[PDB]
Amino acid sequence: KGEKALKASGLVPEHADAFKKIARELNTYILFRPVNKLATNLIKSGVATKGLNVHGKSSDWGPVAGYIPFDQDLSKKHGQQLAVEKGNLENKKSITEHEGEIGKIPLKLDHLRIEELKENGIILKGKKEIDNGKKYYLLESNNQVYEFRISDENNEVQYKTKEGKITVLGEKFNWRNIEVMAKNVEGVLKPLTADYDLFALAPSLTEIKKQIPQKEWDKVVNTPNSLEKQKGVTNLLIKYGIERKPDSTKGTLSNWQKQMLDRLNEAVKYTGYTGGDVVNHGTEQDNEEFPEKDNEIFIINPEGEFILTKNWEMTGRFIEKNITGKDYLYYFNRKAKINTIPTSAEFIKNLSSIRRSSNVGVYKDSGDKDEFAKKESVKKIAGYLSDYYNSANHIFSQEKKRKISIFRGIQAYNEIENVLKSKQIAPEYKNYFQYLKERITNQVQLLLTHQKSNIEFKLLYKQLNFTENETDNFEVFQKIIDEK
């Protein structure tokens, strides 16, 4: 937190000041994932950010790294040489996937990066041998097994391993240029560096009132009881935010999220960033290739405070206290899962990920009555896990979101118990359902003990019996929970 936030985060300071300017002019409470200072100097130099095109991110070492490489030894597979062939294959399909707009331009080198990285002990002051017939600035890298040779007189990088050592790889790569990816912004090609990353946003209710047309907000003026407000915010979210297009250009967003991110990101056009959108993809919850546990997040408010958190459970504490605990909606990109679980889209993603290795189970590759019956059960299960995050009923206190979340979770639990009266299923999907039922009972119990009323869980499961209606049983749920 503070200037320690911006230095242990690793971002541009004047980008943060431009974000403060556009936040003071727009009033949106966005978040940021920290990107290191190895690529940040190249953001200040002029080469802009990548998108969601290559998902093997750049290393945390290397004076020539920061850009996404074709040979992924300059990526996170450092020393794990059996995966560098799959890295070359994945960057072959990353090249051949985004064709039409991509070119082949290498890194634009500078002498200033290696003098600003003198702290690694890059130059050994021993013998000065003229290798390859050229006056070379002799550098010794972080290790002896591979040297990352930046050129001195060539615009292209002349990186080449030594001609007297042997490794376990065997592919002594020649003095070629680096093969990093490209993107055509306003006609001129540009290399791609480590992209900036965000987490969420929580805009003010008058900004949503002025960004969504006025009829939906003259609806808000005549809302006496909270169930009609629940219906209004839910069908607003259905007619606006369910159109999540799975894309690989700018990130899995909606329309208004994209245009407000563009209006929040255009503030660097007069500061020194020649690209505009400094974040060209979604989050890491929106990057579905590898689930990265984000250890710390960067907090940006329109008031002007710089907070970088420490712990992940404390990050969820900050979210549920500042975002959800007050009158602000939690517009996040949608045994140890206490409060925030992977959402309904991630639920279907986990379902497919277990489905790819499980041949049989609950329902198989056919269309019978139990098959499509448990298919409609799991689509309404996904609907209930989606409506579990009904974080827009914040007109009264957080207890209202608590009781609505418990109502949706108990509907989900009754759906799970409706599913388990079927045929003899495979043990993979069986203990999948066991983990889901244990997680949902522990979540509903630890929310019930947090909120009110000291009731058991099985008591609330036994007293609640809903068959074909949910606007009547919310009254008996309110009669049990409230009005003691």
CSV table of C-alpha atoms in Angstrom, one decimal:
chain,number,residue,atom,x,y,z
A,1,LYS,CA,0.0,0.0,0.0
A,2,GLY,CA,1.2,3.5,-0.9
A,3,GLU,CA,4.2,4.0,-3.1
A,4,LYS,CA,5.3,0.5,-2.0
A,5,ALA,CA,2.1,-0.5,-3.8
A,6,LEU,CA,3.3,1.0,-7.1
A,7,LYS,CA,6.9,-0.3,-6.7
A,8,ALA,CA,6.0,-3.8,-5.6
A,9,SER,CA,3.3,-3.8,-8.3
A,10,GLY,CA,5.7,-2.7,-11.0
A,11,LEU,CA,3.5,-0.4,-13.1
A,12,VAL,CA,4.1,3.1,-14.7
A,13,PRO,CA,3.5,5.9,-12.2
A,14,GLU,CA,2.1,8.4,-14.7
A,15,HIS,CA,-0.2,5.6,-16.0
A,16,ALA,CA,-1.5,5.4,-12.5
A,17,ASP,CA,-1.9,9.2,-12.4
A,18,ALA,CA,-3.8,9.1,-15.7
A,19,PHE,CA,-6.0,6.4,-14.2
A,20,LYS,CA,-6.6,8.7,-11.2
A,21,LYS,CA,-7.6,11.5,-13.7
A,22,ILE,CA,-10.1,9.3,-15.6
A,23,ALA,CA,-11.4,7.9,-12.3
A,24,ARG,CA,-12.0,11.4,-10.9
A,25,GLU,CA,-13.8,12.1,-14.2
A,26,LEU,CA,-15.7,8.8,-14.4
A,27,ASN,CA,-16.0,7.4,-10.8
A,28,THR,CA,-15.3,3.7,-11.3
A,29,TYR,CA,-13.6,1.5,-8.7
A,30,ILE,CA,-11.4,-0.7,-10.8
A,31,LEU,CA,-8.7,-3.2,-9.7
A,32,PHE,CA,-5.4,-4.2,-11.2
A,33,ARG,CA,-3.1,-7.3,-11.3
A,34,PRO,CA,0.6,-6.4,-10.9
A,35,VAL,CA,3.0,-6.7,-13.8
A,36,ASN,CA,6.7,-6.4,-13.1
A,37,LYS,CA,9.2,-3.7,-14.0
A,38,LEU,CA,11.1,-5.9,-16.5
A,39,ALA,CA,8.6,-5.1,-19.2
A,40,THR,CA,7.3,-1.8,-17.8
A,41,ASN,CA,10.4,0.2,-19.0
A,42,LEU,CA,9.4,-1.1,-22.5
A,43,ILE,CA,5.9,0.1,-22.0
A,44,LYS,CA,7.4,3.5,-21.2
A,45,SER,CA,9.8,3.1,-24.2
A,46,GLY,CA,7.1,2.8,-26.9
A,47,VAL,CA,6.4,-0.9,-27.6
A,48,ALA,CA,2.9,-1.6,-26.4
A,49,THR,CA,1.1,-4.5,-24.8
A,50,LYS,CA,0.0,-7.9,-26.1
A,51,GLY,CA,-3.6,-9.2,-26.0
A,52,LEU,CA,-5.0,-12.6,-25.4
A,53,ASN,CA,-3.0,-14.0,-28.3
A,54,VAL,CA,-0.2,-15.9,-26.5
A,55,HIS,CA,-0.9,-17.3,-23.1
A,56,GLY,CA,2.6,-18.4,-22.2
A,57,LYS,CA,3.6,-15.2,-20.4
A,58,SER,CA,7.1,-13.7,-20.3
A,59,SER,CA,9.8,-14.7,-17.8
A,60,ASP,CA,10.9,-12.9,-14.6
A,61,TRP,CA,14.5,-13.1,-15.7
A,62,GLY,CA,16.4,-12.1,-18.8
A,63,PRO,CA,17.6,-8.7,-20.1
A,64,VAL,CA,16.1,-9.7,-23.5
A,65,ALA,CA,12.8,-11.1,-22.1
A,66,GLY,CA,9.6,-9.3,-21.4
A,67,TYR,CA,8.3,-10.1,-24.8
A,68,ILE,CA,6.5,-13.4,-25.7
A,69,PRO,CA,9.0,-15.7,-27.5
A,70,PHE,CA,8.5,-18.4,-30.1
A,71,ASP,CA,11.0,-20.7,-28.4
A,72,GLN,CA,9.5,-20.8,-24.9
A,73,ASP,CA,12.8,-21.4,-23.1
A,74,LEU,CA,12.6,-17.6,-22.6
A,75,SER,CA,9.2,-18.3,-20.9
A,76,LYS,CA,8.2,-20.0,-17.6
A,77,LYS,CA,9.5,-23.4,-18.8
A,78,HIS,CA,13.1,-22.4,-17.9
A,79,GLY,CA,15.2,-25.6,-17.6
A,80,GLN,CA,12.1,-27.8,-18.2
A,81,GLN,CA,13.4,-28.7,-21.6
A,82,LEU,CA,10.8,-31.4,-22.4
A,83,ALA,CA,8.1,-28.7,-22.7
A,84,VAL,CA,10.0,-26.3,-25.0
A,85,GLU,CA,8.9,-28.4,-28.0
A,86,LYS,CA,5.3,-28.0,-27.0
A,87,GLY,CA,6.1,-24.3,-26.5
A,88,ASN,CA,7.3,-24.0,-30.1
A,89,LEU,CA,4.2,-25.9,-31.2
A,90,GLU,CA,1.9,-23.6,-29.2
A,91,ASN,CA,3.6,-20.5,-30.6
A,92,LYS,CA,3.3,-22.0,-34.1
A,93,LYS,CA,-0.4,-22.3,-33.6
A,94,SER,CA,-0.4,-18.8,-32.0
A,95,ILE,CA,1.2,-17.4,-35.1
A,96,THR,CA,-1.1,-19.3,-37.5
A,97,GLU,CA,-4.2,-18.5,-35.4
A,98,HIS,CA,-4.1,-14.7,-35.5
A,99,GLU,CA,-3.1,-14.3,-39.1
A,100,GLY,CA,-4.5,-11.5,-41.2
A,101,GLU,CA,-3.3,-8.8,-38.8
A,102,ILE,CA,0.0,-10.2,-37.3
A,103,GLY,CA,3.5,-9.7,-38.6
A,104,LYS,CA,7.0,-10.9,-37.8
A,105,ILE,CA,9.1,-8.2,-36.2
A,106,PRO,CA,11.7,-8.8,-33.5
A,107,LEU,CA,12.4,-6.9,-30.2
A,108,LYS,CA,13.5,-3.3,-30.6
A,109,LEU,CA,16.7,-3.4,-28.6
A,110,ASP,CA,18.3,-0.7,-26.4
A,111,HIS,CA,21.6,-0.4,-24.6
A,112,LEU,CA,19.8,1.2,-21.6
A,113,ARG,CA,18.1,-2.0,-20.4
A,114,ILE,CA,21.4,-3.7,-19.6
A,115,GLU,CA,22.9,-0.7,-17.8
A,116,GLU,CA,19.7,-0.4,-15.8
A,117,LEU,CA,20.1,-4.1,-15.1
A,118,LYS,CA,23.8,-3.9,-14.1
A,119,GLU,CA,22.8,-5.5,-10.7
A,120,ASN,CA,22.8,-9.0,-12.1
A,121,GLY,CA,26.6,-8.9,-12.6
A,122,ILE,CA,26.2,-9.2,-16.3
A,123,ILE,CA,29.8,-8.4,-17.5
A,124,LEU,CA,32.7,-10.5,-16.3
A,125,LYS,CA,36.0,-8.5,-16.4
A,126,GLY,CA,38.3,-11.3,-17.4
A,127,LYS,CA,39.4,-12.1,-21.0
A,128,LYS,CA,38.0,-10.2,-24.0
A,129,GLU,CA,37.9,-12.7,-26.9
A,130,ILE,CA,36.5,-11.7,-30.2
A,131,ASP,CA,33.9,-14.3,-31.0
A,132,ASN,CA,32.1,-14.7,-34.3
A,133,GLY,CA,34.5,-12.2,-36.0
A,134,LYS,CA,32.7,-9.2,-34.5
A,135,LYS,CA,33.4,-6.7,-31.6
A,136,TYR,CA,30.9,-8.0,-29.1
A,137,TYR,CA,29.9,-6.7,-25.7
A,138,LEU,CA,30.8,-9.8,-23.8
A,139,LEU,CA,28.1,-10.6,-21.3
A,140,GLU,CA,27.7,-13.6,-18.9
A,141,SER,CA,24.0,-14.3,-18.2
A,142,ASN,CA,22.2,-15.6,-15.1
A,143,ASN,CA,23.6,-19.1,-15.9
A,144,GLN,CA,26.3,-20.6,-18.0
A,145,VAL,CA,24.2,-23.1,-19.9
A,146,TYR,CA,22.6,-20.4,-22.2
A,147,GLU,CA,23.7,-16.9,-23.0
A,148,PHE,CA,21.0,-14.4,-24.2
A,149,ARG,CA,23.2,-12.2,-26.4
A,150,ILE,CA,21.9,-8.7,-27.0
A,151,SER,CA,23.4,-7.1,-30.1
A,152,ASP,CA,25.5,-4.0,-30.0
A,153,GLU,CA,25.4,-2.8,-33.7
A,154,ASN,CA,22.5,-4.9,-35.1
A,155,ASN,CA,18.9,-3.8,-34.9
A,156,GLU,CA,17.9,-7.5,-34.7
A,157,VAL,CA,19.0,-9.4,-31.7
A,158,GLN,CA,22.0,-11.7,-32.2
A,159,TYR,CA,21.3,-14.2,-29.5
A,160,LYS,CA,23.3,-17.4,-29.8
A,161,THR,CA,24.5,-20.1,-27.4
A,162,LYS,CA,28.2,-20.8,-27.1
A,163,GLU,CA,30.2,-23.0,-29.4
A,164,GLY,CA,32.0,-25.1,-26.7
A,165,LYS,CA,29.3,-26.2,-24.3
A,166,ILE,CA,26.7,-29.0,-24.4
A,167,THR,CA,23.3,-29.1,-22.7
A,168,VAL,CA,20.5,-31.7,-22.2
A,169,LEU,CA,18.5,-30.0,-25.0
A,170,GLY,CA,20.9,-30.4,-27.9
A,171,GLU,CA,19.3,-27.7,-30.1
A,172,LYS,CA,22.1,-25.2,-30.2
A,173,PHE,CA,20.0,-22.3,-31.7
A,174,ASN,CA,21.8,-20.1,-34.2
A,175,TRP,CA,22.3,-16.3,-34.1
A,176,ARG,CA,18.8,-15.7,-35.4
A,177,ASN,CA,16.5,-12.8,-34.4
A,178,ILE,CA,13.8,-13.3,-31.8
A,179,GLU,CA,10.4,-14.3,-33.1
A,180,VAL,CA,7.9,-12.3,-31.1
A,181,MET,CA,4.3,-11.6,-32.1
A,182,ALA,CA,2.8,-8.4,-33.5
A,183,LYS,CA,-0.5,-6.4,-33.8
A,184,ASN,CA,-1.5,-3.8,-36.2
A,185,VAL,CA,-2.7,-0.6,-34.4
A,186,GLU,CA,-3.5,2.4,-36.7
A,187,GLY,CA,-1.7,0.7,-39.6
A,188,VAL,CA,1.8,0.7,-38.1
A,189,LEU,CA,3.1,-2.7,-36.8
A,190,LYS,CA,4.3,-3.0,-33.2
A,191,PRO,CA,5.9,-5.7,-31.0
A,192,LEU,CA,4.0,-7.3,-28.2
A,193,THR,CA,5.3,-7.1,-24.6
A,194,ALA,CA,3.8,-8.4,-21.3
A,195,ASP,CA,0.3,-7.0,-21.1
A,196,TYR,CA,-1.1,-5.2,-18.1
A,197,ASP,CA,-3.9,-7.0,-16.2
A,198,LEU,CA,-7.0,-6.0,-14.2
A,199,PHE,CA,-9.3,-7.8,-11.8
A,200,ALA,CA,-12.7,-6.2,-11.4
A,201,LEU,CA,-14.7,-2.9,-11.1
A,202,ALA,CA,-17.4,-1.5,-8.9
A,203,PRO,CA,-18.9,1.6,-10.4
A,204,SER,CA,-21.3,4.1,-8.8
A,205,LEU,CA,-25.0,3.7,-9.1
A,206,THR,CA,-25.4,7.1,-10.8
A,207,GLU,CA,-22.7,6.2,-13.3
A,208,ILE,CA,-24.7,3.0,-14.2
A,209,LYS,CA,-27.8,5.3,-14.2
A,210,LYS,CA,-26.2,7.5,-16.8
A,211,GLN,CA,-24.5,4.7,-18.8
A,212,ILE,CA,-27.7,2.5,-19.1
A,213,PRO,CA,-30.7,4.4,-20.6
A,214,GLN,CA,-33.1,6.4,-18.3
A,215,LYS,CA,-36.2,4.1,-18.5
A,216,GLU,CA,-34.5,1.4,-16.4
A,217,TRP,CA,-33.8,4.1,-13.7
A,218,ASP,CA,-37.2,5.7,-13.7
A,219,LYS,CA,-38.2,2.1,-13.0
A,220,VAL,CA,-36.0,2.4,-9.8
A,221,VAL,CA,-38.0,5.4,-8.6
A,222,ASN,CA,-41.2,3.3,-8.3
A,223,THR,CA,-39.9,0.3,-6.4
A,224,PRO,CA,-41.6,0.1,-2.9
A,225,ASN,CA,-40.7,-3.6,-2.1
A,226,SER,CA,-37.4,-5.3,-2.5
A,227,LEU,CA,-38.6,-8.3,-4.6
A,228,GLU,CA,-39.5,-6.0,-7.5
A,229,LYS,CA,-36.0,-4.5,-7.2
A,230,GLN,CA,-34.6,-8.0,-7.3
A,231,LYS,CA,-36.6,-8.7,-10.4
A,232,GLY,CA,-35.5,-5.5,-12.0
A,233,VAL,CA,-31.7,-5.9,-11.4
A,234,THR,CA,-31.9,-9.6,-12.4
A,235,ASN,CA,-33.7,-9.2,-15.7
A,236,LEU,CA,-31.4,-6.1,-16.3
A,237,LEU,CA,-28.5,-8.5,-15.9
A,238,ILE,CA,-30.2,-11.1,-18.2
A,239,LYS,CA,-30.9,-8.7,-21.0
A,240,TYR,CA,-27.5,-7.0,-20.7
A,241,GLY,CA,-24.7,-9.3,-19.3
A,242,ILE,CA,-25.4,-12.9,-20.4
A,243,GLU,CA,-24.0,-12.2,-23.9
A,244,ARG,CA,-20.5,-13.2,-22.9
A,245,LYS,CA,-18.9,-14.0,-26.3
A,246,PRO,CA,-15.9,-16.4,-25.9
A,247,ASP,CA,-13.3,-14.5,-27.9
A,248,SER,CA,-9.5,-14.2,-28.2
A,249,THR,CA,-9.0,-10.6,-29.3
A,250,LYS,CA,-9.8,-8.2,-26.4
A,251,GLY,CA,-11.0,-10.4,-23.6
A,252,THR,CA,-14.2,-12.1,-22.6
A,253,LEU,CA,-16.3,-9.0,-21.8
A,254,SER,CA,-19.7,-7.6,-22.5
A,255,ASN,CA,-20.4,-4.5,-24.6
A,256,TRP,CA,-20.8,-1.8,-21.9
A,257,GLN,CA,-17.8,-3.3,-20.0
A,258,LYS,CA,-15.7,-3.0,-23.1
A,259,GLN,CA,-16.7,0.6,-24.0
A,260,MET,CA,-16.2,1.8,-20.4
A,261,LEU,CA,-12.8,0.1,-20.2
A,262,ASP,CA,-11.9,1.9,-23.4
A,263,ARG,CA,-13.1,5.2,-22.0
A,264,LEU,CA,-11.1,4.4,-18.8
A,265,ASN,CA,-8.0,3.5,-20.8
A,266,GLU,CA,-8.0,6.4,-23.4
A,267,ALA,CA,-6.6,8.7,-20.7
A,268,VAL,CA,-2.9,7.9,-21.6
A,269,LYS,CA,-3.1,9.4,-25.1
A,270,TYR,CA,-1.5,12.7,-23.8
A,271,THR,CA,0.8,11.1,-21.2
A,272,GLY,CA,3.3,9.0,-23.1
A,273,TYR,CA,1.6,5.7,-24.0
A,274,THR,CA,1.1,5.7,-27.8
A,275,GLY,CA,-1.4,2.8,-27.8
A,276,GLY,CA,-4.4,3.7,-25.8
A,277,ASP,CA,-5.7,0.4,-24.3
A,278,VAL,CA,-2.9,-0.6,-22.0
A,279,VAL,CA,-4.9,-3.7,-21.0
A,280,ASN,CA,-5.8,-5.7,-24.1
A,281,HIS,CA,-7.2,-8.9,-22.5
A,282,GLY,CA,-9.4,-9.9,-19.5
A,283,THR,CA,-8.5,-11.1,-16.1
A,284,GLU,CA,-6.8,-14.3,-14.9
A,285,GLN,CA,-10.3,-15.5,-14.0
A,286,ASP,CA,-11.1,-14.6,-17.6
A,287,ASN,CA,-7.9,-16.3,-18.8
A,288,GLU,CA,-9.0,-20.0,-18.7
A,289,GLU,CA,-5.9,-21.7,-20.0
A,290,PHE,CA,-4.1,-22.1,-16.6
A,291,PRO,CA,-5.8,-21.2,-13.3
A,292,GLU,CA,-3.3,-18.8,-11.7
A,293,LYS,CA,-3.8,-18.1,-8.0
A,294,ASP,CA,-3.4,-14.3,-7.8
A,295,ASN,CA,-1.5,-13.7,-4.6
A,296,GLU,CA,-1.9,-10.0,-4.6
A,297,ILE,CA,-4.1,-7.4,-6.4
A,298,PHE,CA,-3.8,-3.6,-6.9
A,299,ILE,CA,-6.6,-1.4,-5.6
A,300,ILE,CA,-7.4,1.8,-7.5
A,301,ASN,CA,-10.2,4.1,-6.2
A,302,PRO,CA,-11.4,7.5,-7.7
A,303,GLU,CA,-10.6,9.0,-4.3
A,304,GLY,CA,-6.9,8.5,-4.8
A,305,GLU,CA,-5.5,5.7,-2.5
A,306,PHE,CA,-2.9,3.2,-3.6
A,307,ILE,CA,-3.4,-0.2,-1.9
A,308,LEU,CA,-1.6,-3.4,-2.8
A,309,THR,CA,-2.9,-6.3,-0.7
A,310,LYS,CA,-0.9,-9.1,1.0
A,311,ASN,CA,-3.1,-12.2,1.5
A,312,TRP,CA,-5.7,-13.9,-0.6
A,313,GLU,CA,-8.3,-14.5,2.1
A,314,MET,CA,-7.6,-10.9,3.2
A,315,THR,CA,-8.2,-10.0,-0.5
A,316,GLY,CA,-11.6,-11.6,-0.3
A,317,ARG,CA,-12.1,-9.8,3.0
A,318,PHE,CA,-11.3,-6.5,1.3
A,319,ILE,CA,-13.7,-7.4,-1.5
A,320,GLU,CA,-16.6,-8.5,0.8
A,321,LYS,CA,-16.0,-5.5,3.1
A,322,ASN,CA,-15.5,-2.6,0.7
A,323,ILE,CA,-17.2,-3.7,-2.4
A,324,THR,CA,-20.1,-6.0,-1.2
A,325,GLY,CA,-20.3,-4.7,2.4
A,326,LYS,CA,-21.4,-1.2,1.2
A,327,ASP,CA,-23.8,0.0,-1.5
A,328,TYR,CA,-21.8,-1.0,-4.5
A,329,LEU,CA,-22.3,-3.9,-6.9
A,330,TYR,CA,-19.5,-6.4,-7.3
A,331,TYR,CA,-18.9,-6.4,-11.1
A,332,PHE,CA,-16.2,-9.0,-11.2
A,333,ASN,CA,-15.4,-10.9,-14.4
A,334,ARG,CA,-17.4,-14.1,-14.2
A,335,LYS,CA,-12.4,-27.3,0.7
A,336,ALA,CA,-10.7,-23.9,0.9
A,337,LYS,CA,-13.6,-22.0,-0.8
A,338,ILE,CA,-15.1,-20.1,2.1
A,339,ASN,CA,-16.9,-17.2,0.5
A,340,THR,CA,-15.9,-16.8,-3.2
A,341,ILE,CA,-16.1,-19.9,-5.4
A,342,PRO,CA,-15.5,-20.3,-9.1
A,343,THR,CA,-18.7,-19.2,-10.7
A,344,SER,CA,-21.3,-20.8,-13.0
A,345,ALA,CA,-19.3,-20.4,-16.1
A,346,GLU,CA,-16.3,-21.9,-14.3
A,347,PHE,CA,-18.7,-24.5,-13.0
A,348,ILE,CA,-19.5,-25.6,-16.6
A,349,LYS,CA,-15.8,-25.3,-17.4
A,350,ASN,CA,-15.0,-27.7,-14.5
A,351,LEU,CA,-17.8,-30.0,-15.7
A,352,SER,CA,-16.3,-30.2,-19.2
A,353,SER,CA,-12.8,-30.6,-17.8
A,354,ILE,CA,-13.9,-33.6,-15.8
A,355,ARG,CA,-16.0,-34.7,-18.7
A,356,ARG,CA,-13.0,-34.9,-21.1
A,357,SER,CA,-11.4,-37.7,-19.0
A,358,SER,CA,-14.5,-39.3,-17.6
A,359,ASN,CA,-16.2,-41.5,-20.2
A,360,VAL,CA,-19.3,-42.3,-18.1
A,361,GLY,CA,-21.0,-40.9,-15.0
A,362,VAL,CA,-24.2,-38.9,-14.3
A,363,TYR,CA,-25.2,-38.4,-18.0
A,364,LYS,CA,-23.5,-39.7,-21.1
A,365,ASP,CA,-23.3,-39.0,-24.9
A,366,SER,CA,-26.9,-39.9,-25.7
A,367,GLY,CA,-30.4,-38.4,-25.4
A,368,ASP,CA,-32.6,-40.6,-23.2
A,369,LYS,CA,-35.0,-39.4,-20.5
A,370,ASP,CA,-32.6,-39.6,-17.6
A,371,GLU,CA,-30.0,-38.1,-19.9
A,372,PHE,CA,-31.9,-35.0,-20.9
A,373,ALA,CA,-33.5,-34.9,-17.4
A,374,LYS,CA,-30.2,-34.6,-15.7
A,375,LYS,CA,-29.1,-32.2,-18.4
A,376,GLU,CA,-32.0,-29.8,-17.6
A,377,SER,CA,-31.2,-30.4,-13.9
A,378,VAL,CA,-27.6,-29.3,-14.5
A,379,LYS,CA,-28.5,-26.3,-16.6
A,380,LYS,CA,-30.8,-25.1,-13.8
A,381,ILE,CA,-28.0,-25.9,-11.4
A,382,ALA,CA,-25.8,-23.6,-13.5
A,383,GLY,CA,-28.6,-21.0,-13.3
A,384,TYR,CA,-28.8,-21.2,-9.6
A,385,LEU,CA,-25.0,-20.9,-9.2
A,386,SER,CA,-25.2,-17.9,-11.5
A,387,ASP,CA,-28.0,-16.3,-9.4
A,388,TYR,CA,-26.0,-17.0,-6.3
A,389,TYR,CA,-24.0,-13.9,-7.2
A,390,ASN,CA,-27.0,-11.7,-7.1
A,391,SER,CA,-25.0,-8.8,-5.6
A,392,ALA,CA,-27.3,-6.0,-6.8
A,393,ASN,CA,-29.9,-6.2,-4.0
A,394,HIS,CA,-27.8,-3.9,-1.8
A,395,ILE,CA,-30.6,-1.4,-1.1
A,396,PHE,CA,-30.9,-2.7,2.5
A,397,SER,CA,-27.8,-4.0,4.4
A,398,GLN,CA,-25.6,-6.9,3.4
A,399,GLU,CA,-27.9,-9.2,5.3
A,400,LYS,CA,-30.3,-9.0,2.3
A,401,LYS,CA,-27.6,-10.2,-0.1
A,402,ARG,CA,-26.9,-12.9,2.6
A,403,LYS,CA,-30.4,-14.2,2.8
A,404,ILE,CA,-30.8,-14.0,-1.0
A,405,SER,CA,-27.6,-15.9,-1.5
A,406,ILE,CA,-28.7,-18.5,1.1
A,407,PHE,CA,-32.0,-18.9,-0.7
A,408,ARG,CA,-30.2,-19.5,-4.0
A,409,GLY,CA,-27.8,-21.9,-2.4
A,410,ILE,CA,-30.6,-23.9,-0.7
A,411,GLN,CA,-32.4,-24.0,-4.1
A,412,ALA,CA,-29.1,-25.3,-5.6
A,413,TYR,CA,-28.8,-27.9,-2.8
A,414,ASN,CA,-32.3,-29.1,-3.4
A,415,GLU,CA,-31.4,-29.4,-7.1
A,416,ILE,CA,-28.3,-31.5,-6.2
A,417,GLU,CA,-30.4,-33.8,-4.0
A,418,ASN,CA,-33.0,-34.0,-6.8
A,419,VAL,CA,-30.2,-35.3,-9.1
A,420,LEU,CA,-28.8,-38.0,-6.7
A,421,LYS,CA,-32.0,-40.2,-7.0
A,422,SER,CA,-30.8,-41.6,-10.3
A,423,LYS,CA,-28.9,-44.7,-11.6
A,424,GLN,CA,-25.6,-46.2,-10.5
A,425,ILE,CA,-23.2,-43.4,-11.5
A,426,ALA,CA,-19.4,-43.5,-12.0
A,427,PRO,CA,-17.3,-42.7,-8.9
A,428,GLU,CA,-15.6,-39.8,-10.6
A,429,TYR,CA,-18.8,-37.8,-11.0
A,430,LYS,CA,-20.0,-39.3,-7.7
A,431,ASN,CA,-17.3,-37.8,-5.6
A,432,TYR,CA,-17.5,-34.7,-7.8
A,433,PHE,CA,-21.1,-34.4,-6.5
A,434,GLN,CA,-19.8,-35.3,-3.0
A,435,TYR,CA,-17.3,-32.4,-3.1
A,436,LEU,CA,-20.0,-30.1,-4.5
A,437,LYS,CA,-22.5,-31.0,-1.8
A,438,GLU,CA,-19.9,-30.8,1.0
A,439,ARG,CA,-18.8,-27.4,-0.3
A,440,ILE,CA,-22.3,-26.0,-0.5
A,441,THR,CA,-23.4,-27.3,3.0
A,442,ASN,CA,-20.2,-25.9,4.5
A,443,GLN,CA,-20.7,-22.6,2.7
A,444,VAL,CA,-24.4,-22.3,3.7
A,445,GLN,CA,-23.6,-23.3,7.3
A,446,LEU,CA,-20.7,-20.9,7.7
A,447,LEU,CA,-22.8,-18.1,6.2
A,448,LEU,CA,-25.7,-18.9,8.5
A,449,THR,CA,-23.6,-18.8,11.7
A,450,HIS,CA,-22.2,-15.5,10.4
A,451,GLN,CA,-25.5,-13.8,9.7
A,452,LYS,CA,-28.3,-14.6,12.3
A,453,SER,CA,-30.7,-16.9,13.9
A,454,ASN,CA,-28.5,-19.9,15.0
A,455,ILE,CA,-30.5,-22.4,13.0
A,456,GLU,CA,-29.1,-25.7,11.9
A,457,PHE,CA,-28.7,-26.6,8.3
A,458,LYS,CA,-30.8,-29.8,8.2
A,459,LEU,CA,-33.6,-27.9,10.0
A,460,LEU,CA,-33.7,-25.4,7.2
A,461,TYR,CA,-33.6,-28.1,4.6
A,462,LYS,CA,-36.4,-30.1,6.2
A,463,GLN,CA,-38.7,-27.1,6.9
A,464,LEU,CA,-38.3,-25.7,3.4
A,465,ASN,CA,-40.3,-27.6,0.7
A,466,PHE,CA,-40.6,-25.9,-2.7
A,467,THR,CA,-42.0,-27.8,-5.6
A,468,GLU,CA,-42.9,-25.6,-8.6
A,469,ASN,CA,-42.7,-22.0,-7.2
A,470,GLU,CA,-40.0,-19.7,-5.7
A,471,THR,CA,-41.9,-16.5,-5.2
A,472,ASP,CA,-44.0,-18.1,-2.4
A,473,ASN,CA,-41.3,-20.0,-0.5
A,474,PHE,CA,-39.2,-16.8,-0.1
A,475,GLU,CA,-41.9,-15.7,2.3
A,476,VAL,CA,-41.6,-18.8,4.4
A,477,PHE,CA,-37.8,-18.5,4.3
A,478,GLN,CA,-38.2,-14.9,5.5
A,479,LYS,CA,-40.7,-16.1,8.1
A,480,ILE,CA,-38.1,-18.6,9.4
A,481,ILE,CA,-35.0,-16.4,9.2
A,482,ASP,CA,-36.5,-12.9,9.9
A,483,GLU,CA,-39.4,-12.1,12.3
A,484,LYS,CA,-38.2,-14.3,15.2
